[PDB]
Symmetry: C3
């Protein structure tokens, strides 16, 4: 149960890291608008991963 | 405390889902731009993220 | 351990708050397309802190 929480929290954290990775690409593209398409595809990749990680976190947490 | 932690985490995770939704719309607009309501939509989802995280901290304080 | 879980999640929540601050600056910039540069600069600062906070979260969590 304690282990249950830890494993779940870990997925939440990776989900957050994925959002941070996505947010840094945002800064790059916004800067630029003053390669972008490959940055956009990249954002999509890390965003889907964030979503994948959060669903896992939620799936686990439910087990508590 | 275990049940309180759980209840607190659920809000955190909801907060993250909202940011992801906010990031979805961000990607849309950026994609649109390199080829107003999307914006209104970002605000709604971001504010819910705030409410969720706020709630998470409140329950967390009871632990 | 519960004291530790609370400690790590605490940091996790801080990180989320910083991502929210970064998202707020993004909406502003997207709406401007104000002070894009300044705006894009706060985004970066906000994101960095978020990053610092998640790493502290991951660190504490490992103590569980």
């Amino acid at each position: 149960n304690i282990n249950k929480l830890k494993s779940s929290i870990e997925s939440t954290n990776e989900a957050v890291v994925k959002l941070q990775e996505t947010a840094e690409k945002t800064v790059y593209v916004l800067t630029a608008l003053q390669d972008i398409s490959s940055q956009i595809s990249s954002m999509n990749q890390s965003l889907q991963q964030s979503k994948d990680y959060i669903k896992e976190a939620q799936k686990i947490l439910d087990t508590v």
